[PDB]
């Protein structure tokens, strides 16, 4: 947990229906976006951070939380975006001899700012006399090892935690959901979806001259009017379907 990995996800399609067999007994409780519609969305930059923590400490992986893990091992920003995943891993990360390979920082001068890694192993001086490399009284090694005890409840069992950080912008998309790319139909009342932008209207060929960097098109009321499809790099107009009053 103290030396958590960091992985970059880009230029790929991310599917979430696959994350059932790989991570049984998962818990996708998360922040910043409704998980129900992660399928039809696009994410500009995705960061995956993985580590192993105890069962009772899984609640510490959340914005605004305080604790041993949140202060000294992994601090999340208050305005956090993205979803976290945690599932029990007793079958994989428990040894009869004793799992002494997972280390967590216990002593630290000051709390971590969000998204920081501390790999330092300098001896902690908890008293007045300098330690000078001695690990006696009031001189403690900052890193302690998890002593998992599966005989107790799930609060003493290793939980593997994977934390995903999104950005949620809809234009320079490089990571999008697993949905397909249906062929476009013109001059028909359809409800479209362009890089996570969902709207209903009729799509017509346009003569509006977008600059090479421009993507969208706004009307007076700041609602999208002309849009550029991700494929074929074409320019289109969005016109609401026919409507009116009945007398």
């Amino acid at each position, epitope marked *: 947990v103290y*030396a958590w*990995n960091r992985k970059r996800i880009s230029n790929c399609v991310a599917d979430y229906s696959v994350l059932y067999n790989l991570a049984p007994f998962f818990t996708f409780k998360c922040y910043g976006v409704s998980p129900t519609k992660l399928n039809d969305l696009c994410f500009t930059n995705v960061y995956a951070d993985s580590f192993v923590i105890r069962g009772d400490e899984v609640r510490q992986i959340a914005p605004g939380q305080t604790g041993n893990i949140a202060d000294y091992n992994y601090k999340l920003p208050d305005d956090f975006t993205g979803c976290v995943i945690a599932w029990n891993s007793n079958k994989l990360d428990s040894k009869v001899s004793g799992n002494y390979n997972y*280390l967590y920082r216990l002593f630290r001068k000051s709390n971590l700012k969000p998204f920081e890694r501390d790999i330092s192993t300098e001896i902690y001086q908890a008293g007045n006399k300098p330690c000078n490399g001695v690990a006696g009284f009031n001189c403690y090694f900052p890193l302690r090892s998890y002593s998992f005890r599966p005989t107790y409840g799930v609060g003493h069992q290793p939980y593997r935690v994977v934390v995903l950080s999104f950005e949620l912008l809809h234009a320079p998309a490089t990571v999008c959901g697993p949905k397909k790319s249906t062929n476009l139909v013109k001059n028909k009342c359809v409800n479209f979806n362009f890089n996570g932008l969902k709207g209903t209207g009729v799509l017509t060929e346009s003569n509006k001259k977008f600059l090479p960097f421009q993507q969208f098109g706004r009307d007076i009321a700041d609602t999208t009017d002309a849009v550029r499809d991700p494929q074929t790099l074409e320019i289109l107009d969005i016109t609401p379907c026919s409507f009116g009053g009945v007398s």
Partner: antibody
Amino acid sequence: QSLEESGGDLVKPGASLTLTCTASGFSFSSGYDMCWVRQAPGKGLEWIACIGTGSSGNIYYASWAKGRFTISKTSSTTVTLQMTSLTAADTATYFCARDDADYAGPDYFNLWGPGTLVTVSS
Amino acid sequence: DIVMTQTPASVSEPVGGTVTIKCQASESISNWLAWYQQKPGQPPKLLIYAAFTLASGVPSRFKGSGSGTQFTLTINGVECADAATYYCQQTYSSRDVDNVFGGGTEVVVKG
């Protein structure tokens, strides 16, 4: 407990040999990983292949020995590795090491055998 | 997938000095590492597992340090019996890896 090896002799090039790693004082439990390495006469250690002694062996091979080598367990106290087409550079000292965790791969090698000398010549 | 290098190739110091050895990885291995000591004509022995923990029966003179990508092994005092070869092992992912061990670094103690 000891993990002495056997089956080491002079072998002509382009031939086959079958080394045998035999445990002494214990049997192959399922919670440990029995695994193979070699050492060139003047180079460092290098890893060949690695087999799990559990119910379903998580058999693993190195990139430079993808199909040249093949590891297999034959009994409760014998694990055998055999290789075909020994080239001039395959001469080495083969150590049969035991692991300490069944994580489908070679973890820390807590236990080592005395090692056997296998050379190739004409 | 993960490859390591061991530096320096060789070191030498008086009996009263301290030697340091660097083992770096291509990608982050976090904690999983091991330091093996091999005497000539003898199978190697485990010294440091989990990159910090001393082995069993090893004197408290070998210190492991660092985590993630850079690892350093420090010997606070040599006694002419530590002149041997030392290797570092990834023990993190060996699915498709040419060699888990690192290169050779032999220590020469000029008594």
